[PDB]
Every structure is written in structure tokens, then in C-alpha cells.
Design a protein around this nucleic acid. Sequence first.
RNA 1: GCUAAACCUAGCCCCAAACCCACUCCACCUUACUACCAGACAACCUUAGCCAAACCAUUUACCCAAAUAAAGUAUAGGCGAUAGAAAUUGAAACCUGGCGCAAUAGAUAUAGUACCGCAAGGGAAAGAUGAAAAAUUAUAACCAAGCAUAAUAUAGCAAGGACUAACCCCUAUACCUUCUGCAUAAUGAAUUAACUAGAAAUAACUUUGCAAGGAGAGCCAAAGCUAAGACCCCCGAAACCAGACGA
RNA 2: CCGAGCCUGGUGAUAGCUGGUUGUCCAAGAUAGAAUCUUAGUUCAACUUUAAAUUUGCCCACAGAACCCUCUAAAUCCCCUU
RNA 3: CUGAACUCCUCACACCCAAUUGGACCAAUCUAUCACCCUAUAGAAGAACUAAUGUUAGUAUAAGUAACAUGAAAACAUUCUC
RNA 4: CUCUUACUUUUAACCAGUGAAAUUGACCUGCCCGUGAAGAGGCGGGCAUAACACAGCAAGACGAGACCCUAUGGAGCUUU
RNA 5: AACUUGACCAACGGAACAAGUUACCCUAGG
Lengths: 107, 166, 188, 95, 135, 93, 188, 140
Amino acid sequence: TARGTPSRFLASVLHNGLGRYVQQLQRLSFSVSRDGASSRGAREFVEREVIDFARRNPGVVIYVNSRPCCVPRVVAEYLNGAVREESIHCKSVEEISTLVQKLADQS
Amino acid sequence: ISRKWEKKNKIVYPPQLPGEPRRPAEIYHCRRQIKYSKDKMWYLAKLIRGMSIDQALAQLEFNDKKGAKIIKEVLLEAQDMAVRDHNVEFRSNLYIAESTSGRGQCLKRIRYHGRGRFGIMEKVYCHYFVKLVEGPPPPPEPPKTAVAHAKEYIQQLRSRTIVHTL
Amino acid sequence: VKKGFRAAFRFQKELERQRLLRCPPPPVRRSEKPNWDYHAEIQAFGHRLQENFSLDLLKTAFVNSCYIKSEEAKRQQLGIVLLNLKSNQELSEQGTSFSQTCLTQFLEDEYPDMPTEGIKNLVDFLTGEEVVCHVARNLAVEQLTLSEEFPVPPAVLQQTFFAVIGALLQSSGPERTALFIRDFLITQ
Amino acid sequence: LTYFSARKGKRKTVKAVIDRFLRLHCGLWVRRKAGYKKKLWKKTPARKKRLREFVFCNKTQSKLLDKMTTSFWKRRNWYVDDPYQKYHDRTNLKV
Amino acid sequence: RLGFEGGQTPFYIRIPKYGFNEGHSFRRQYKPLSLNRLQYLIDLGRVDPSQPIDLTQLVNGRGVTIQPLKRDYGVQLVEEGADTFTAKVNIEVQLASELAIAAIEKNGGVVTTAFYDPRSLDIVCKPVPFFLRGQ
Amino acid sequence: IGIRLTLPPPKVVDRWNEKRAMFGVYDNIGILGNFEKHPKELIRGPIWLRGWKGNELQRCIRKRKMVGSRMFADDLHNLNKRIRYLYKHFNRH
Amino acid sequence: NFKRISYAKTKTRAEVRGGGRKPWPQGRARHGSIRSPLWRGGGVAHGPRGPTSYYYMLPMKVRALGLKVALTVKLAQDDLHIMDSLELPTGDPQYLTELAHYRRWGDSVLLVDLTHEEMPQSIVEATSRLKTFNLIPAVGLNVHSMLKHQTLVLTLPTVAFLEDKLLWQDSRYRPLYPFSLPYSDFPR
Amino acid sequence: LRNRVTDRYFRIQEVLKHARHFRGRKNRCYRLAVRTVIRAFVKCTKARYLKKKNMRTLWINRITAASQEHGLKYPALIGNLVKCQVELNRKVLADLAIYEPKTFKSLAALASRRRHEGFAAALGDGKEPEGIFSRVVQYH
RNA sequence: GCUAAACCUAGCCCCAAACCCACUCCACCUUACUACCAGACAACCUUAGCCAAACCAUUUACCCAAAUAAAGUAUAGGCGAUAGAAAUUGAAACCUGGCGCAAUAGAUAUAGUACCGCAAGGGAAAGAUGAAAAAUUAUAACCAAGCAUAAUAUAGCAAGGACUAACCCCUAUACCUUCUGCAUAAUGAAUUAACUAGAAAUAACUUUGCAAGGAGAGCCAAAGCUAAGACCCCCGAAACCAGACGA
RNA sequence: CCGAGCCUGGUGAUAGCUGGUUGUCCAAGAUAGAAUCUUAGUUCAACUUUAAAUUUGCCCACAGAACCCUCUAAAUCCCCUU
RNA sequence: CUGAACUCCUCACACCCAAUUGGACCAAUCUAUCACCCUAUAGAAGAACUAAUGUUAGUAUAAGUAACAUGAAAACAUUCUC
RNA sequence: CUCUUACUUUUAACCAGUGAAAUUGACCUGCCCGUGAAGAGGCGGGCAUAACACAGCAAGACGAGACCCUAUGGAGCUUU
RNA sequence: AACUUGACCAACGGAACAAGUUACCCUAGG
Ligand SMILES: [K+]
Ligand SMILES: [K+]
Ligand SMILES: [K+]
Ligand SMILES: [K+]
Ligand SMILES: [K+]
Ligand SMILES: [Mg+2]
Ligand SMILES: [Mg+2]
Ligand SMILES: [Mg+2]
Ligand SMILES: [Mg+2]
Ligand SMILES: [Mg+2]
Ligand SMILES: [Mg+2]
Ligand SMILES: [Mg+2]
Ligand SMILES: [Mg+2]
Ligand SMILES: [Mg+2]
Ligand SMILES: [Mg+2]
Ligand SMILES: [Mg+2]
Ligand SMILES: [Mg+2]
Ligand SMILES: [Mg+2]
Ligand SMILES: [Mg+2]
Ligand SMILES: [Mg+2]
Ligand SMILES: [Mg+2]
Ligand SMILES: [Mg+2]
């Protein structure tokens, strides 16, 4: 550590939930390799999971960029300007589904 | 080795707009591989920090230490360079913004001890760095007054929150 | 020299982080960065707020007069089709008018014993540049705003926020817009 | 025990073991009783009879003897009219 | 070292010497060939009863494995399987039991016991390697 | 300190150079060639390590046996010393 | 690995130059030698002691089974093409390259003919200028090459040769002596 | 094949990033830092036990002070509130004392009333009826 | 901001294949490198001690001409440790390569030099621009310890919990080794960087193959046999022996 | 630092006893005995690991285990049920 | 009444025993094949260091400390003192 | 020596130049009592306490600084 | 010849067979 790290108080963005609930996640950017063992899970996620997630979260804009990469990543951007980059390297579809939904629910 | 100090004079700023206040000129100068210890040189560099160019030259002129003459020559070179190459108007309108000493490249020599042990003596060298800024010396920050102390203490009391509760 | 690539590459990325922190680049608009599609961003803006915005009206809300002038100057100097872009001036007037009267009715009902001077000052604070710009930034309004200068000047950002409220007023009517005023301005 | 001979780099047999023990193919080791030939005059007939028996070694001893001998001493042999032929194979041993 | 108990006389040393293995390398050994095995070999066409059966035919049909370097002196015919032995054969072995001889004779076959020396046994068991020596 | 400040020259491996393209060819010379030749005959290398494997002690013993007479004086002296050192080491002396 | 010979070798403390004496600096024993592994320039305590052989042999039947599996895997995945012959209309490599592309063979093709001597000159000339189109005799067939090349091309005579050699392992006796020596039914 | 660690720098930075705020050479020399960092991490793990203990001690101190303002000792308030089937924990009671003084005075008055009912019952032989606030609600 | 940092080559290692070397002129066994006087001196002779037997007293090794096998068998031996055949058997071998090192590595080697020693002998350290230096005000910088920029404010293994708040409050007897499982008493460490220490495959187990047979001669086999996988560290005496060097 | 020089080699000599022995996670995991020129060490024991096979293991009802004088109590061995 | 890592409570749950053994995972390196802003599946090995009375290099502390040095004047000619 | 005193030189201290070594786990380095304590700067209780050079001192920390037995080891030399 | 016999090997799980001394000491850790 507490002494070695920063801290903050419990807070919300724009009093979210007081009048209405707004999903803070607005953008997800995926980088996926067409070829690359580490992107196998990300490729499978794009085939069978991304479309259903996109419909469930119309407020979020999802960019899927297929290009050569060794480490596939998902960049999550929020309404308050926060940018959170995560790695989906060698993650299964279930693990990627869990991470993506976790990003969707964070403020 | 590193020679960044020499390159600082090569920075070129964009032409200032008429509204902008006139930017004070900055001159960077140094002397490498002075035959002197940085520890001894530090006291001389410290002494002239914040002084005007004339006040620094006066103090160094009557200083007995060997480093004083060396720093005085560097200061005179920096003063001449400021007016000639950096478009400084008045040579006296300069003050010591930064003055420090740095460890030079030292030489190790075979030395001896009174009982026949073999020793290494280092021949010490140092660097002297100076930065001159156009304008009068910035006034020294005044002493903290009683009124300032009271204001700080009352401010601390007013910032108190009820700790570890709702 | 130690043979290997992974450690050197990792240290290169480390050095790049310091090169960024030592000289933080000049902030730029989100629209210039990668992974940006304006039409998709506009559609998400409405759905995110659970509002049935008219896309044609919502797009006009983000068009500021300053942007139209700057675009014309760029086109003329780089001689190259008539541009019929409508600015958000008309929408921002309707939104500003509705917001002032909508907030007044809200406050007068809640605080009947408040003097008119008090009610006006509250409406000025809620619609003030400070409050509105803070709300607009946290609702992705600045990302969709079309302006000549970035970061969007406070005055331009406030004008765009009320222009969006004007677009909502035409799209969904006064009752729906009032709940938008309550959820994002009364909460402030 | 030599695990790697100087000239062949092969494990060696302890010849002391070959002199004193018989290994049945089933893994049992047979030996004589110590002192079976010594001081018979001061030993009772019952003691003398058990001293001339051929007895088996325990598990711990058998494993040690196995390490001290190379695979050649553990091969199956078909000697003509071998007195210990029948004992090489176990019968009705459930374990 | 292995076999050292830390001071006392080791177990493998305190046991008296007895000639269990004395002269083992000079003892003669005979691989056992049973009537069951011989009948099984004939049934599967690996030994042909219509010709004289000797060590060469037994080895060629993979019926027995002879190691002359391990003091094997040939095959010893054993009576196991005599009750069910039905083949009529002319077979040459090195040793045969009384019951084994009776089983072959009862079917009209002929059994003879012959001696091969270490050099002869090596040649008879593997003729082709011998012929390649050029002797 | 201790880590290179620049990237090393990019590694470019030709996967389809003649050596890689023909690797493994004739490893079945015996199975497919009437066993006229054994695969171990393909092995190139020290005369004392062709189609044979062993620990360091066994290798040193084998090398001295096969080429010991042709070795240089100092090399042979080192080999003899190594064998004696390894003989004690591998026999737990 | 079976034909791998590693030539890496280091020097032990007994092989490094000098170091025989006990260093005098004040007893002499505190360090036994200046070439101790702990000393800069000393011997390597546990370094490679080559040349080191990795030779071993899989059972003959296992190596034969590997060839069967590789052939079966290629056919099951539509990577095996059978040719009547490897005769070509011309010796130009561009023809063979275009032919493989038109038939969707793949980036790399292994061409297997019955015998080295009777290989058609046209296919010999074409494949000699191609890096990924490799021509080998039937005796050279091996699992590594088959896996390295995406496509396997066998001539009809090669198929009969392969089946004869590999099936022989299934029905053969245990060996009395090496199959190089004469047998009643081998070869043929 | 000779192998040497090439990423030791990152291994050291993992320790050092936790020692930046330390004093002296502990904050930069790895061999000194690691030992201090290990002690810090151990203290951080154990402190979670002390955090709960000290927080409860703080609530009791504040509840004691709040109770004394109404003439009630801490054991009287806590125990008697339990006898009224009021299960407010110490953290909430401390929060109430600070931010809800009127409600806290009521709780103190309720505890004082229940305490007096206990005194009257102790003097009685049980023939009389129980106090109004003494009556316990039963659950099944 | 200094000190510094960073680098990729010099070469080297292990194999393969091939049997190497050396008289410009002059000088050189006397005090070598000294143009030029009666010589006469002549070489040959078991290695030893000792790794081990937990001492040591007989006893163990370093060569003699083909991989493999016979075989760790015969045999020798305080019959202990340990040593260890032969008859017989009988293969391949195409230099120009590397899952070798890359400046504390790899040769000691930039060099047997500097330096140390009377002598035998011992024996280092280190270099880094670029296409062009007949482009040098060009080759940006960012990184260890050490410092500088910038000394310090009650209180205590220097932190942790935290806090509006650096400190003040509360909590906390550095670590390692060893002594019984007990270091505030004994050991070790200025700090940074680099270097620095577990090497068997018989059996058994596991996973394939084939199976009364297995194995690419030899060997094993009363479900075996073949193949693979996986097990045995670093530094640190006196002494002893051989041959030199030194008054 | 010569109670027997120095150097090289034998030599990574031997013994003795310290010291050191480098990523993570999960599972199991602390015994206290006998012989020995042996007690600063070792090997059979005690405890301990992995895998495998099979069937009881622990706790414990009655009955039962010496006379000779037992300090003679506290206990032990054995042992179904549970 | 206060008062544990005991117990309960919301959630989680394989995450506190040396040596040792068993089962997984893994930094970097090289090789095969992938990959192509730094990866994957395997094969391999000089494969990971706050624990050294260890080696080499750099730089501290002690410390600007201990210690070291040039007889006098002058015109620098010379003279004077010892 | 009672019983030391004075002066000179050196050292010394200050200024200027040059500039070592042993040592050093880290250090934000107090006292009393207690704790095995005459084993406590660091633990318990109590007391004390703004910060920071220089010159001394030598109570403590800290360092510069024989004998014992044990090992199935030697070497001289002495012989019963 | 065989059947058999024999070490107070008493340091008695027994090395086939060997003492003093070092205050000139050498080496070893505790
Ligand atoms: K060197
Ligand atoms: K002389
Ligand atoms: K006087
Ligand atoms: K005390
Ligand atoms: K003192
Ligand atoms: Mg040597
Ligand atoms: Mg080396
Ligand atoms: Mg509690
Ligand atoms: Mg021979
Ligand atoms: Mg070198
Ligand atoms: Mg201590
Ligand atoms: Mg230690
Ligand atoms: Mg003389
Ligand atoms: Mg466990
Ligand atoms: Mg029972
Ligand atoms: Mg619990
Ligand atoms: Mg290593
Ligand atoms: Mg001092
Ligand atoms: Mg002095
Ligand atoms: Mg003087
Ligand atoms: Mg006196
Ligand atoms: Mg001075």
C-alpha cells in the first residue's frame, strides 16, 4: 504494498447508475494473427464469440484487425479516457470470453 | 564519455510571437579534464550559484584555491561567448544559473607504502559545468515568516478529516 | 555481446517507454489514431445512452462552424464538389433553450421556496462551461466533435453538448429529452 | 564395486559373491551356514544338522547380491542333471 | 564402497565359500525341445516331417535358439507333450529322455542322439555364416 | 549495463537450402535397400564415434584405444589423465 | 539425433595452461591453483566434453511402421498424388511450378521416383533449379522429408516398391543373422 | 552450447520497483533491496490481521467516548443492545455516534432503559412481569 | 549532468583429410650469436611414489597394431580391495564439417611479450565510428554501482498499516551458517557487473514396437524382448615420488 | 616460516572437516535404534517417497498370562463389540 | 466487557514443515519446423545465484583523512645564511 | 622519583598543492533497569530527545589483535 | 586319504603381520 503504490477513493464516472446506467467501455480493439499458434484462441473467439458479444453490447465499438503478430492483444478504451491493454496470447476462447466480459463490466 | 553539455548551445528555438515575453538567453559552457578533484571543485561551483557574472568573478578572483582561477577563466569565456555568439546585449546582464563539478576520466598510478605494500594512486581529474542566463540574479527566497508559519499550521488543521469512518 | 534476441527486444520496448515519458508526445484527436470509424462511433454514442437518435441530426450536432471554415481554407489552398455541411448552431440554440427551461421547471418543482435568482444561478451552474464540459468529455462527445482545434475549446465543447440535446429533442421529443437532462445534468 | 571398468567401461562382478552363493533363476540366493565345518565336536546333532542346510537369503541381501553380479550370472541355464534344476522356477506363489 | 558395512565383516564375506558355481563355464548345456513345441512347429509348417529333422532345420524354423558361446551343446528332447504328440518324424538330437523316445517311436518315427562339438555345433546351427568364411 | 542497446542483425535462415531440403534422405537405406548398408554407415564424424554412444569415461577409453597411438603427446597425456580422473569419479572413489 | 555428433568441448582445470603451482600469496594451499573454475581464466567445472555421440537405433519394425504412418497420413489429408511417371513435356522449372500451383499442391513438393539412375532427365533438370521441389529415389524416402514437404508425389512403380519393402516387415521371421547375408527367399 | 542469462536486468527490476520509496542504498542496490523488500512483503501480509484488530479497537474507543457523553459505559451499551435484539455491529455504532448523534442517543437511551429493566428483574423474584423492552421476539 | 554504458570482430575449439618443418649474405657450443692453431669429455642401466584397500605392510594404472562379440567369462588376488585374458568372431570409413566459443568466453597468447625470479621457472592485461575522416563541430539520446542536479529537523533493522498530510500514531529483536528443533553472545558479507557448483541407465517403473518369441550375428526368453525416458556437485592440507634449478 | 630449499611434472594426489551448491507450483514428508581401530563417519535397523497387489488395521468386553513373598500401586500383554 | 491465523459469517479454496521423493509448469539459449514488434510444438544443453573467508573488473567508505615538498633577498645578474 | 616546570625543534592545528591503507551486512547508530545480561544503541518498562561542523578523550561498540582435545594423517629423530 | 582338528584372534563382529617422542614441530577443524 500500500505504501509503495498509489491509492484513490471509491468513485463512479458521472454518478453512473444514479439516473441511468451507462456502460463505460466504449471501444475494444483486437489484434489477431491469421497464422500464429498464439492467436489460435483469438481466431476462434472472432469466429464464434465476437459477433454475439457485439450484439449484446451495442454501445461498444469493436475493431478486429487481422495482421501478423506474435502477441495478440485487446485494447479496451473507456468513456473517462482510460486505456487498458490486455494480452490474449495463447488464451483459449473461454479465457478470452471471460477477459472480454470483465473489461465490459469495469468502469 | 558523455558530452551533452556542449550540445545544449546548439538548440534553436522557433521565432517568438510579438505577444510572448522575451525569452532570456541561456549559455552552456564547461571545461573538461581539469586537474583537480570534483570534491574540492564542488565548493567553488557551489559558491557562485545564483550570483551575477560580475559578483562571481569578484569572489573567485580573491579565492586562494587553485580551482577558482580555472572557473574564472571558464566564466570569462562564457561571458564573451554569450555576447558574441548568443546575441546577449550587456555582458554584465548575466547570472550563474547552474554551476557544478563532475568526475573526470582519472589515471591510476602505481604508488608505494611505507612497509613495501603495492598501491594504486589515482590522479584525479574533474569537469566544471556552468549555465549562464540573461538577466539579473533571481532574488533569494526570503525567510519563512511567523505569519507564513501560522497560515501553514492552520491550513493543516483545516485539512483534517475524520479518519477511518463513513 | 551475449547471443539472443528476446532480451534485446524487450529492452528496446523498455527504452521506448522512457523515450515517451521523457518527451510526452503532443496529444491528438482520437479520430486520427488507429481503430476509428466515425459512422460506427456515432451509432454507438446513441445506443450507449439508450437513446434513439436520428443519425442525420446527431451527425449535424457535432459539426461546429469553426470546423466548416477550417475545412474550406484547407480545400482552397490545396486546390482540387460543393460542400453543403450544416453547422450545429441551430441545434445548439434549441438545445440550450430547452435545457434552460427544462432545468428551471425541474428546480422550481423541487424547491418551490427558492427565489428566482437562486433558481437562475443553479441553472447557470448546471449549464455552465465547467459542468457541461466535464459531462461532455465523459460521454465521448469530444471524441465525436468536429472542430479546428484539439483539445476542443471549452466554448465549442459546450455548444456541441447542447447541440446533441437539440438533436435528441427533435428525435425523441421533450419528455425523453427531459430524462436525459435529469440523468446527466441534475445529477451534477 | 566397479561400475565402469578401466578397459571396457562395463560393470564388473564381485567374484567373492560367486564363490559363496548360488542364484536361482527366480531371484533366490542359496548359501551355506557359517561355521558348518568348524568345531563339530562341541556341537549337538540338532545344531550340526541345521548348520549343513542350504538356506535362502532375505530380500535385502538378495537385492544387494543382484547388484554385485552382472547379467550373465542371472541367465537361465540348462545344465544336464542339475541338482537345483527344479528350484529355479517358483510354484503356487501368489504374493 | 558397496558391500562395506562400516567396519564389520560384510555379509557376503562372512558366508563360507562353497562350490555352487565351480566349473560352471565348463558344464555342458542343452536347450530343451518339447514334443509340444515340436508338434506345434510341425503343425504350423515351420518344421517339415517329410525330411530328416536336425539342428539346422530346427534352427531354420526358429524352433530353438542355440548359443554355442554359452556352452550350449545342442537340443535335449523332453517328454513334455508326449500324450498329444502325433507326428511321424526322423529327428536327430543330442539328448533324449526315455519317454520322449517312446513317444516318437510309437508314431512310427525314428529318433537318434548325436554329438556335436562346439565348432561343429556353431557351423550346423548357422551354415551360411560358415560358408562365407571360405573354409 | 550488460544488455545491448540495439537490436542484433535480423536472423535470416534459409529453410530450403540444399542441406535442410535433403535432411533425412537415406535414413532408411537398410529397410528400403535390401539391408546392403546400415543407417549408421551414413554417420560422419570421429572414427571412434561412428555408430556408437557412451558416457565421457567410455568415450575417452574408446578414443585412446582406436586413435591413442596417433595422438599428439600432450593430448595423449591429457587423455590418460582424464580417464584416470573419470575412473575414480564414475566408480564413486 | 541418431547421426548427431556434437563437437563442443571445454578445458577442465587439468587442461588449462599452467596452474600447476599453489599460488604463493599469504599458507599456499588457500587456493590450490590459479586455474580453478572459480578463477577467471580457469577450467570449466562441468562443460561439454565432446566430441559427443547421440547415436541410437529404433527397432527395425518401428522405423518401418513410421514410414507406413507417414504414407497413410499423407493420403488421409489429400497430400498424396500418384503419378504414372515423372516425365515432363519440358525441363523448364517454371512449368513444374505452375503445374503444382494449378493443381493446388502446396509450397513444397517431394518427388519420389523408383531409382536414381532411371530418373527422367526432364524432371531432373526442373527440380535441380527448384528449392522446394525436391526429387529423391525410393530408397531415400524418410519420415522427416515427408513431413518437411507439404505434398508427396509417388510414381506407380514406387508404390509397388514401397508396399513390398514395408509389408515384408510384417510377415518376416526373427533374424538368424543380418539380412545382408544370403537367405532362401531374400532378396526376392 | 554455452548459455548465459540475457534478461537479468528485468529480473533485478522486479525487486527494485518495490524498493524505490525506501531510504538509502536499500532503494537501488539489489542485494540490499531484496532483503528489505522481502521484509516489507512479509509485513504487508501480516498487517491485514492487525488492520482488522486496530479498526475494531478504534470503533470501541469511539463508541466508549460516545457512550460516556450519555453517562453510559461501553459494556452497558453493547450488552444491553444485544438484549434488545439489536445486532448493530461496532463499526456501524461508531459511524452512528459521529454522523447520527440523535439516533445514537436513542440507542444509548434504549440501552439504559434495558439496563434498568434488568436491575428491576434482579430485585424481583420473578413473580412480576418482564419489562416491555426486555421481551424477546422468538423465531422458529 | 558526469563517470559510464552498449557493439563484432580478432581469433580460437572440436573433427575430417593429408605423414610436417627449415642453407639470401654474415654471425653463432669460447662469456652462443665472437673471421683465423696440435683435438681427444663422450650416449646406452627395472620409473618412482601413489590414486584404493576408508590405516597400512603383498596387492591397483598409465604402450605394443581390427570396431563388434566371446566377456566382465576363464583366471589372478591380505581369494580382500581389486585386477582380468585368449581361442574364436568379425563391420564400416567419400576431407573441405559443427543444436562449438565470440574479448572475464574461446588458445596463456595482441605474447611466451610486458612483468616477476640468480636460475630452472612463473606469466598477464587489452580492441570496437562511418560507404568515405582527402566527410570530425559527427556518431542523437535513454540503462549498474558511484556521484551531481538537490545536506540535514525529536524516535530507533528504517519498513508495514495507513493517512488530507513526507514525518509524527500503531505494529515489527536484519539475514545466513552452525550450536538440540535455541543466534541481541558465535560464523560471513562495502557495493555494482560478469563468472561460479549433480556427470550412472544393470535392474525396476513409464510409454511405444513385435510377441513364444524379441533383437539389423554375439544376447535374453517358463510373457518375454527391443527402443526410449529418467539417478549420483564446487572450492580448500601436510606429505610422498621423478627430474631439473640454485652457494 | 628451511626441523629440512626451490621449480616442473606425477596432480583435478590423498585424507579430515568446514563452507557453498543458482526459476515456480502441487502432493507426500521429522525418526531418535544396533554393530564398527567405531562414536565429527558408516552399513544393516527406526521414520520417510513413488507405484503396485491384496485384506484387514487402529480403538478395544469378558476370559486369560508364577511361583518365589509383591514396596504395589500406577500400568502392560492379549482382545470381540464398537 | 475486552481478547487469536480457534469458530461462525460473505466469497474463495490445490496455495505455511527441512532433507527427500513424486507430479506439473517455466526464464533465456541453441536446433527442427512454425512464426514474423518477438511467437508456437518439439529436440537439445556450458540452462537461471541476496546466501562463498571464491575470481576478475568498476566505483564507494575510511577521507580530501594519514602522509609528502621549495634556505633568503634581488636586477634573476648575483649576493647572503647555514 | 618526591613533583613537576620552562623554553627550542619536530609533530601538531589553520591556509594552499598533491593525495594512501586496514576497515565497512544495512543503519534514521541515546540513557537507566529488566530480560541467562558484568551478553543490549536495536527486545520489555521507564526516561531523554530541533538540526548540523571542528578539536580532544579512550569507558563501550568495533577492531589491530598462545593453550586444549579431537584425524583409523604426516616427518624428523630415538631405540629394548 | 578321509572323517576332521587348530589363534586368551580377551581391543573377544576378530586388519595376516608395526613402538616411543616433538617445549624445533608440520597439516586439519572445533
Ligand atoms: K588470458
Ligand atoms: K661459488
Ligand atoms: K620552570
Ligand atoms: K544489561
Ligand atoms: K575507546
Ligand atoms: Mg596441472
Ligand atoms: Mg578458459
Ligand atoms: Mg477480535
Ligand atoms: Mg582375440
Ligand atoms: Mg582471453
Ligand atoms: Mg551476531
Ligand atoms: Mg557462512
Ligand atoms: Mg661465494
Ligand atoms: Mg503437503
Ligand atoms: Mg482386534
Ligand atoms: Mg482454521
Ligand atoms: Mg553452470
Ligand atoms: Mg579521521
Ligand atoms: Mg599531518
Ligand atoms: Mg620537512
Ligand atoms: Mg612525573
Ligand atoms: Mg590540506
